[PDB]
Amino acid sequence: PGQGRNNSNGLEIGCVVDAASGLLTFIANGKELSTYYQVEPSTKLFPA
Amino acid sequence: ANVVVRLLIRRPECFGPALRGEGGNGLLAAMEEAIKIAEDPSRDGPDTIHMGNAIMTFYAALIDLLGRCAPEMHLIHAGKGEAIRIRSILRSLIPLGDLVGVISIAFQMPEPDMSAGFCPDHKAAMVLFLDRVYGIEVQDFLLHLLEVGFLPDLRAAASLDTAALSATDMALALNRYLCTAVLPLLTRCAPLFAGTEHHASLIDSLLHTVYRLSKGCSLTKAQRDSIEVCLLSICGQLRPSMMQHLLRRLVFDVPLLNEHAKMPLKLLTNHYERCWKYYCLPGGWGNFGAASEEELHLSRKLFWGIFDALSQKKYEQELFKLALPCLSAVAGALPPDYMPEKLEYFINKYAEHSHDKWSMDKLANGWIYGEIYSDSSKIQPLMLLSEKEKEIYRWPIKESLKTMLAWDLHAMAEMMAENYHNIWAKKKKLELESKGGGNHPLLVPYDTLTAKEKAKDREKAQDIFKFLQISGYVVSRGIEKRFAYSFLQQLIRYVDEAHQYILEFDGGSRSKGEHFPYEQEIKFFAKVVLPLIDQYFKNHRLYFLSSNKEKEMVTSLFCKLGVLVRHRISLFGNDATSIVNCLHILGQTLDARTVMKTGLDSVKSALRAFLDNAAEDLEKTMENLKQGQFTHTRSQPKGVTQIINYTTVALLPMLSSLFEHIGQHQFGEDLILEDVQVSCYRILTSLYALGTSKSIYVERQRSALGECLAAFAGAFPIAFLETHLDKHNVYSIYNTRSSRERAALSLPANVEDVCPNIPSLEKLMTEIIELAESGIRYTQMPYMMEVVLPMLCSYMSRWWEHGPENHPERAEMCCTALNSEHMNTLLGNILKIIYNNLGIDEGAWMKRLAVFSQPIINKVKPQLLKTHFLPLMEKLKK
């Protein structure tokens, strides 16, 4: 809240993929997001 | 030129020291130093000769000499390699950027000023060199030259326009150089700057500055003509959407109808005629776009402005003949179907939101809180603008609200931006007057200025209006039948007024040497409005089959005009052809189906009465020609002569057009019935007897007689020659009307008695067979080779469409007995006659017979080929 007008460097969204557990996690400017995903084994994920 | 160039290149010492490579000072720097010489009295040291002026004239003369000794014209340069070498040498000699700089060096607007300094002849020399040697082709190059120096000279001309300022010799000389600089654009690169808009600001500035120039005072006739040609070319091949501001200016200026109004009349004429689709078609002129609602409103306002202005204006042959194409073009382009406490709260809310916006913007830039508002250290007390700045900027918001309250949202924002620009221009003009300085070009309005300066105020206007709509306050300035009904109502009022003028003029005795004002009004009508109506019905949907009350007004106007022509054709001595052509187009655009349904009953009864009057005139012509009174008869009464002339000239082709349209659109079954049928039988009898009469004037007018009779036969949906077969037809007047009703309508109990003079259908068969046997010719019996053979051709075409072979189910109901066998018989008779004609040199009628049989060539049996087609064409080969 407030980063749309206060952040001069923009928004950075970092995506982390743990392939051993099939876990996708997201971080917003150093703050961990509550939204995470679990994928199936042998799944190929494309950054997009 | 070649030897001069050789000598100059061999000895560069002839050139100026700046131009020579020993110094390399440059031409632009040479003129700058000449200006400095002029400023410095010591530099222009001791009838007297201005030393800098002497240098400057020397350089201008050298530039002019080089430009004139350049290759003559483009094909000479292309073909002659030596000319290519000369042009390359001159290009290397003189840089293009130096030419641009010298053409940009502007003059001092005078309180006289002495002729010393840069002069229009110098600019003319440099622009001539740039035009001839380097060439002026690239579009960005054109725009750059226009913005650099070219437009500033136009701004100076706009300033110099005023009477004393034109009294200045600077204005006079600049006018000469201005012609020599304006002719370039059009002659060389009319298409290009009009094909692009990369500097639409420059485009509009050029257009309105040239227009203000055209509104000059001391301009010579040739100068004004040159300006007018420039404006016409630029407009006639510039994008319609990008000179709308100029459209506005001409909209205010044309209704004045002054001497200067001639050029804008041409301008609008060409604009509308050119982009007609843009202002009428839904998609307009394709990718060019379509006229916005504002453009259509402006065009309509100008249309009625010119209409009323020409109505009030005294009729001038030149002025009105020039204005008629303009009004016609605008008519063609216009589509036929075209139709407080809250503000204080808004100020408070906008102030809060603007404070938030300033805080956000300053923190994004990197500002810090501080007492001072200086941007060097990036400190603000409003977290660039301070609290004092905010409270003073509050004032223009309230001023704009008050202004537009005393006066959609985007249009009002543009209006407020123009108002603030005008007040700022007034303030800066007052400051300049107080300081005793020259007037800046920004004093002229936003439209006269470029579009770029408008955007600065437009951004603020858009912002304040966004805040207004966020707050929730909306402020402003404060049928398709009606479009036509209005302008056609001007026409109907015109026609009623003309009827009144003609009636009054006929009632009052003519005065020798005194022209009637009513007659003057009649002449003005017949020479302006009368041509305009036909152009209206051309390229306009007025019968609304592509406004039913529009169709009714068209029919009523037709009735009024027909009555006027019937009673007072002789008055329209020179406009008779025009009004008859307007009757033709009225019949072409007339919807008789609407005359029958959704048409005012008094209007349709008046149409019936007018057709009955035409029948009465035809009967009078019958009687006069039978008695021997025609044009060739010297002893002919004036009224009889008027009746015969009216009939033969106007009434035949006009009714021909009406009945042709009726037959094409199947309007006979709806308009022609009952009393109309009785009057149409009267017309049929009249035409038949007139054709039968062998008078010389009848022979002269035979074409129209037949044309009308055939048109009537086609248009009619009922049988009128099937004497012994009309009983079978359901549409028959004898089947519908009773015996007593027909007796009241003046019809006997026998169709044979109704049409006794005309031979029956079987007797027509026998006569046509006799034609085929005897080999009639227009020399011996023209009446039914080239006059009535078309009649029976159209007759049999109509009844062949409605005959038993086309309608086997209705064969008993089909009164006609004309089949495909009869079709072959008639076509074969035509070709037998044509074969008899083959081998004479008078058969101008055969081509007419071909035209007559053209509708009936593709509905025959193939058996006719070997019988007749081969012999005729074999003899043609012979």
Swiss-Prot record, chain B:
Q: In which tissues is it expressed?
A: Highly expressed in heart, lung, cerebellum and brain. Detected at lower levels in adrenal gland, stomach, thymus, esophagus and ovary.
What are the sequence repeat spans here?
Answer: 408-487
Residues bearing Phosphoserine are S509
Q: Where in the cell is it found?
A: Sarcoplasmic reticulum membrane
> What happens without the gene?
Embryonically lethal. Embryos die at about 10 dpc, due to defects in heart tube development. Cardiac myotubes display enlarged rough endoplasmic reticulum and cytoplasmic vesicles that contain high levels of Ca(2+).
PTM summary from the entry reads: Channel activity is modulated by phosphorylation. Phosphorylation is increased in failing heart, leading to calcium leaks and increased cytoplasmic Ca(2+) levels.
Q: What is known of its domains?
A: The calcium release channel activity resides in the C-terminal region while the remaining part of the protein resides in the cytoplasm.
- What is the role of the protein in this entry? Cytosolic calcium-activated calcium channel that mediates the release of Ca(2+) from the sarcoplasmic reticulum into the cytosol and thereby plays a key role in triggering cardiac muscle contraction. Aberrant channel activation can lead to cardiac arrhythmia. In cardiac myocytes, calcium release is triggered by increased Ca(2+) cytosolic levels due to activation of the L-type calcium channel CACNA1C. The calcium channel activity is modulated by formation of heterotetramers with RYR3. Required for cellular calcium ion homeostasis. Required for embryonic heart development.
The similarity annotation says: Belongs to the ryanodine receptor (TC 1.A.3.1) family. RYR2 subfamily.
**Quaternary structure and interacting proteins, as annotated:** Homotetramer. Can also form heterotetramers with RYR1 and RYR3. Interacts with CALM and S100A1; these interactions regulate channel activity. Identified in a complex composed of RYR2, FKBP1B, PKA catalytic subunit, PRKAR2A, AKAP6, and the protein phosphatases PP2A and PP1. Interacts directly with FKBP1B, PKA, PP1 and PP2A. Interacts with FKBP1A and FKBP1B; these interactions may stabilize the channel in its closed state and prevent Ca(2+) leaks. Interacts with SELENON. Identified in a complex, composed of FSD2, CMYA5 and RYR2.
**What name goes with this protein?**
Ryanodine receptor 2
Q: Which organism is it from?
A: Mus musculus (Mouse)
Residues represented out of the complete protein = 2316 to 3327 of 4966
